[PDB]
Amino acid sequence: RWAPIPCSMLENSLGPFPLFLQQVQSDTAQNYTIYYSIRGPGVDQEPRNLFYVERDTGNLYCTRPVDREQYESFEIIAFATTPDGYTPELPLPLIIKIEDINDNEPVFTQDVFVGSVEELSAAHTLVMKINATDADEPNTLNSKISYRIVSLEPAYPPVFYLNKDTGEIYTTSVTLDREEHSSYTLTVEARDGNGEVTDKPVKQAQVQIRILDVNDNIPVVENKVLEGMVEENQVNVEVTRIKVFDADEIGSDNWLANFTFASGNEGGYFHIETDAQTNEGIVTLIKEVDYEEMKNLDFSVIVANKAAFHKSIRSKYKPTPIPIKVKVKNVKEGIHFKSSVISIYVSESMDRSSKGQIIGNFQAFDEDTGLPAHARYVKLEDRDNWISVDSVTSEIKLAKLPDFESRYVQNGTYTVKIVAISEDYPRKTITGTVLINVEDINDNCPTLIEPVQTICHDAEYVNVTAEDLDGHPNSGPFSFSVIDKPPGMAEKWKIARQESTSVLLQQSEKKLGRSEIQFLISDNQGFSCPEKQVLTLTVCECLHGSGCREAH
Ligand SMILES: *[C@@H]1O[C@H](CO)[C@@H](O[C@@H]2O[C@H](CO)[C@@H](O[C@@H]3O[C@H](CO[C@H]4O[C@H](CO)[C@@H](O)[C@H](O[C@@H]5O[C@H](CO)[C@@H](O[C@@H]6O[C@H](CO)[C@H](O)[C@H](O)[C@H]6O)[C@H](O)[C@H]5NC(C)=O)[C@@H]4O)[C@@H](O)[C@H](O[C@H]4O[C@H](CO)[C@@H](O)[C@H](O)[C@@H]4O[C@@H]4O[C@H](CO)[C@@H](O)[C@H](O)[C@H]4NC(C)=O)[C@@H]3O)[C@H](O)[C@H]2NC(C)=O)[C@H](O)[C@H]1NC(C)=O
Ligand SMILES: *[C@@H]1O[C@H](CO[C@@H]2O[C@@H](C)[C@@H](O)[C@@H](O)[C@@H]2O)[C@@H](O[C@@H]2O[C@H](CO)[C@@H](O[C@@H]3O[C@H](CO[C@H]4O[C@H](CO)[C@@H](O)[C@H](O)[C@@H]4O)[C@@H](O)[C@H](O[C@H]4O[C@H](CO)[C@@H](O)[C@H](O)[C@@H]4O)[C@@H]3O)[C@H](O)[C@H]2NC(C)=O)[C@H](O)[C@H]1NC(C)=O
Ligand SMILES: *[C@@H]1O[C@H](CO)[C@@H](O[C@@H]2O[C@H](CO)[C@@H](O)[C@H](O)[C@H]2NC(C)=O)[C@H](O)[C@H]1NC(C)=O
Ligand SMILES: *[C@@H]1O[C@H](CO)[C@@H](O)[C@H](O)[C@H]1NC(C)=O
Ligand SMILES: *[C@@H]1O[C@H](CO)[C@@H](O)[C@H](O)[C@H]1NC(C)=O
Ligand SMILES: *[C@H]1O[C@H](CO)[C@@H](O)[C@H](O)[C@@H]1O
Ligand SMILES: *[C@H]1O[C@H](CO)[C@@H](O)[C@H](O)[C@@H]1O
Ligand SMILES: *[C@H]1O[C@H](CO)[C@@H](O)[C@H](O)[C@@H]1O
Ligand SMILES: [Ca+2]
Ligand SMILES: [Ca+2]
Ligand SMILES: [Ca+2]
Ligand SMILES: [Ca+2]
Ligand SMILES: [Ca+2]
Ligand SMILES: [Ca+2]
Ligand SMILES: [Ca+2]
Ligand SMILES: [Ca+2]
Ligand SMILES: [Ca+2]
Ligand SMILES: [Ca+2]
Ligand SMILES: [Ca+2]
Ligand SMILES: [Cl-]
Ligand SMILES: [Cl-]
CATH class of the missing domain: 2.60.40.60 (Cadherins)
Incomplete structure (x- = not known):
């Protein structure tokens, strides 16, 4: 169809009142004698006495101004008839639009904005966004906002660009530097219309941009x-x-x-x-x-x-x-040993190590000067008395031919402490240690541990065990050999299984009585005792848990 033309009223009508809006007229007015009147939201309902029509000329007046930021439009209907009663007259829906006018300035959603940006930021990087509002008609100059920078701290160089239309803030081509200026504090302005700068006072807010740090400086x-x-x-x-x-x-x-x-x-x-x-x-x-x-x-x-x-x-x-x-x-330290540990190598043979020879010493030196110090040397923890230590020159000598098989010897090494006391006051006491490493010579042969033992009649085997006190390789595995004395006995008594240091022995005939079994037990070096290694083995009759039958 077709839209209707609404009269354009200017908001905040200065005057003069009553204001002439327009003039409605009917053509069926020459036949009859038509009056005039008006009705709708604006005369008879919310609110009244805005407009009114002269009951004959059809001229619509106005009597009160209005704010467009309250009453955008207005839909009224026009009925006008004689003083008789007129029924079939289509009333046109007249409408009346109140034009807008810039009667309110833009205002910031905040009195202070706050933003932050990294140092050394690439150009045209978005900082933040300020924003404001205009209650006027949208998409008109009276609502088009224009943001501008009033002042800046520290003002120079300018490192910020304000898009006047969007309010978005950006970094310029000049690079930011926190070490130069760490924080920027800004005062901003918002304008409407053509964003033109006049001398008219417009509202203003503030922006506080903090610059963040980056590690861009060497220590x-x-x-x-x-x-x-x-x-x-x-x-x-x-x-x-x-x-x-x-x-x-x-x-x-x-x-x-x-x-x-x-x-x-x-x-x-x-x-x-x-x-x-x-x-x-x-x-x-x-x-x-x-x-x-x-x-x-x-x-x-x-x-x-x-x-x-x-x-x-x-x-x-x-x-x-x-x-x-x-x-x-430097500091005074007194006497000391160049080495807390000495290693001395001796032998079990009289051919090299002799009872009473010198085998070394333990000279004490004043640590600070390094010269041989006068001291009083003393033996300590010599469990078997192998050593004599001269109290004056610290010379060391044998008191016994060293026995490698000694129970006091360990790892093939015989440990002995020594002590030295300093002359002059104070008496300083330091301890030395001598590792006596003994050369093991093959001076022990494999001998039995139980050469006399008595087994049962039900016994399965016999356990003969030898003992070569020497350390490897002068002990090692033994070679057992049961010899034929008396004759035939090599067959009567046999070897079943043998280990390194023992052997399991079984008699074939299984007779009850004593037997003297001669062996030849040989070293890993082949050595063997001069003594006849003989096993005197008595077989008695064993009663259950009773040992032997002691008589009737
Ligand atoms: C205010 O009051 C006014 C009072 O009349 C009124 O005006 C009237 O409006 C009518 C339209 O609705 C007009 O009608 C048209 O008339 C023309 C020609 O009419 C003239 O010529 C005729 C012969 O020559 C004559 O008979 C006509 O009528 C008579 O006139 C006298 C006075 O002049 C009357 O006497 C008065 O009576 C009083 C008591 O009642 C009293 O006694 C007075 O003293 C006395 O003088 C008499 O009553 C009157 N008679 C009639 C019957 O009217 C007049 O002189 C026609 O050519 C028109 O034809 C169209 O309409 C017809 C309607 O049916 C169709 O049949 C036609 O085919 C044709 O229709 C279409 O027309 C279009 C073009 O427009 C074509 O394109 C189409 O093709 C066609 N369709 C087809 C199908 O063919 C029409 O009839 C009337 O003339 C007019 N009168 C006056 C005086 O102005 C006003 O309208 C009122 N105001 C308002 C705003 O409403
Ligand atoms: C003929 O008899 C030989 C000895 O006779 C036996 O001696 C003891 C062990 C009893 O069995 C007793 O009834 C017998 O008269 C025998 O030689 C021995 O054989 C055993 C097994 O073949 C060996 O056992 C192993 O012992 C070693 C350590 O042994 C030395 O160290 C321990 C301390 O840990 C000393 O207490 C001993 O005296 C040894 O000097 C173990 O490492 C190993 O594992 C477990 O055994 C011991 C107990 O022996 C436990 O304490 C450990 O914690 C382990 O859990 C073996 O068991 C044994 O060394 C060996 N020699 C001696 C001197 O005992 C021989 O084998 C017999 N003949 C034949 C053909 O078997
Ligand atoms: C700060 O010093 C520490 C201490 O050394 C560094 O840590 C070392 O880094 C090297 C290289 O990866 C490793 O091989 C070391 O094992 C690390 N040592 C320790 C104790 O963590 C650390 O890398 C240094 N920091 C910086 C940023 O250079
Ligand atoms: C701009 O103002 C409008 C109106 O309050 C609001 O909805 C919008 O979030 C604002 N923009 C920003 C970026 O704050
Ligand atoms: C002495 O024997 C022990 C026990 O096996 C070993 O840990 C150590 O290394 C040996 N010391 C030597 C071979 O000087
Ligand atoms: C260290 O050795 C002994 C430990 O008492 C003292 O008697 C000596 O005089 C020195 O102080
Ligand atoms: C060195 O060592 C002994 C013990 O090993 C200490 O007790 C003594 O004082 C000496 O200085
Ligand atoms: C040799 O060994 C003893 C440990 O038994 C040490 O304490 C001492 O000081 C010396 O050097
Ligand atoms: Ca207003
Ligand atoms: Ca307005
Ligand atoms: Ca405005
Ligand atoms: Ca920097
Ligand atoms: Ca920095
Ligand atoms: Ca740094
Ligand atoms: Ca010193
Ligand atoms: Ca020192
Ligand atoms: Ca020996
Ligand atoms: Ca030896
Ligand atoms: Ca041996
Ligand atoms: Cl270089
Ligand atoms: Cl063998």
Whole structure:
């Protein structure tokens, strides 16, 4: 169909009132004698006395102004008839639209906005978005907002672009730098219409942009002198504090120092840890040092951040080691041994080791000067008295021919302590240790342990066991040989199974009585006792749990 033309009324009608809106007229008005009147939301219902028509001319007036931000449109109906009563007259639905006018300024949803952006951000990266509202007619100049920057802190250089239409904030081609300016605080303005700058006061808010930190600054040592100082024989003491400076955000892992030993500490003498409060590398000892051995313990360390460096600065960074000298102070220690342990090798044979020979010494030296010190040497824990120690020259000599088979000998080594006391006050007592390693010679033959034993009549076998006290290879496995004496007995008594140091023996005939069984037990070297190894074996009759039948 066709839309109706609505009269255009200007909101906030200054005047003069009563305001002439328009004039409705009927053509069937010359025949009859038509009056005029009006009815709808705006005259007879919500609200009344806005408009009214003269009952004859058809002229519609207005008597009160109105706000378009309350009454967008208005649908009324036009009926106008004579004073008789007129029934079939189609009333046109007149409509009346109130035009809009910029009667309200744009306003921010907040009096203060807050945003944040990383340092070294690529250009045209979105920071945040401010926003405001205009209660006027949308899609008209009276509602088109135009955002502008009034002022900026610290004003220069300009690192921010404000899209005046969207309110979105962006970073410019000039790169941001937190170390230059860490935070930006801004005052903004919003305009309507053509976004034109006049001298008219418009509302304004504020924006506070915080710049976030990135690790884009290498650490630097500030210490003028880097020399350490430590005493001899000390532990757990502070060597040096390396004061390091970093530009990045204090407290962050981008600012916290980090240390690693480049060289000079795979001996493990130093431990380093970072003081998170002053940013000092605290290096400390974890091992005593002997000045008489090491007069300087210089070393190097490389510096960095707990967090990795930003890509922007990588490979421009050459890890350059930093040297730091350390000196050791001397201290009096008195007499000592060059070695707490001496190894002395002796033999069980009279052909080399002789009872009463000198076999070594234990000279005590004043640790500080290194010269032979006057001391009083003394034996200690010589369980079988193998040694004589001269109290004056510390010379050591045999008191017995050393017996490798001695129960006091262990691992083939006979351990003996020694002590030295210093002259002058105070008496310092230090202990030495001598490992006497004895050469084992084949001086023991395999002998039985139970040469006289008595078995039962129901016994299955016999267990003869030998014993060569020598250590390998002068004992090793034995070779058992039952010999034919008396004759035939080699057959009467047989070997069943043999081990290294024993053999299981069974008699074939199984007669009840004593038998003297001669063996020849031989070493692993072939040696065998001069004595006849004879087994005197008596077979009695065993009653159950009764041993032998002791008579009737
Ligand atoms: C205000 O009041 C007015 C009072 O009349 C009124 O005006 C009237 O409106 C009518 C339309 O609805 C008009 O009718 C048209 O008339 C023309 C020609 O008419 C003239 O010529 C005729 C012969 O020459 C004559 O007979 C006509 O009528 C007579 O007129 C006298 C006075 O002039 C009347 O006497 C008065 O009576 C009083 C008491 O009642 C009193 O005594 C007075 O003293 C006395 O003078 C008399 O009563 C009257 N008689 C009649 C019968 O009207 C007049 O002189 C025609 O050509 C038109 O024809 C169309 O309409 C017909 C309707 O059926 C169809 O049959 C036709 O075919 C044709 O239809 C279509 O037309 C279109 C073109 O328009 C074509 O394209 C189509 O093809 C066609 N369709 C087909 C099918 O063919 C029509 O009849 C009337 O003339 C007019 N009168 C006056 C005086 O103005 C107003 O309308 C009122 N105001 C409002 C706003 O409503
Ligand atoms: C002929 O008899 C030989 C000895 O006679 C026996 O001696 C004891 C063990 C009793 O059985 C007794 O009834 C007999 O008269 C026999 O030689 C022995 O044989 C056994 C098994 O073949 C060997 O046992 C092994 O012992 C070693 C350690 O032994 C030495 O160390 C222990 C301390 O741990 C000393 O107490 C002993 O005196 C030995 O000097 C073990 O490592 C191993 O495992 C378990 O055995 C021992 C008990 O013997 C446990 O205490 C451990 O904790 C382990 O759980 C073996 O059991 C034995 O060494 C060997 N020699 C001696 C001197 O006992 C011989 O085998 C017989 N003839 C034949 C043909 O078998
Ligand atoms: C800060 O120093 C520590 C201490 O050494 C570094 O940790 C070492 O890293 C290397 C390389 O992967 C490993 O081989 C070591 O085993 C690590 N040692 C320890 C104790 O963790 C750490 O990498 C350094 N931090 C930075 C960012 O360089
Ligand atoms: C802009 O203002 C409207 C109206 O309050 C709101 O719905 C919208 O979220 C705002 N935009 C932003 C980015 O806050
Ligand atoms: C002494 O014997 C023990 C026990 O088997 C062994 O651990 C040690 O290495 C031996 N000492 C030597 C071979 O000097
Ligand atoms: C160390 O050895 C003994 C242990 O008492 C002392 O008597 C000696 O004088 C030295 O101090
Ligand atoms: C060395 O060693 C003994 C014990 O082995 C100590 O008790 C003594 O004081 C000496 O200095
Ligand atoms: C040799 O061995 C003893 C251990 O029994 C040590 O304590 C001593 O100091 C010496 O060097
Ligand atoms: Ca208004
Ligand atoms: Ca408005
Ligand atoms: Ca506006
Ligand atoms: Ca920077
Ligand atoms: Ca930074
Ligand atoms: Ca850093
Ligand atoms: Ca020393
Ligand atoms: Ca010293
Ligand atoms: Ca011996
Ligand atoms: Ca021996
Ligand atoms: Ca032997
Ligand atoms: Cl280079
Ligand atoms: Cl054999």
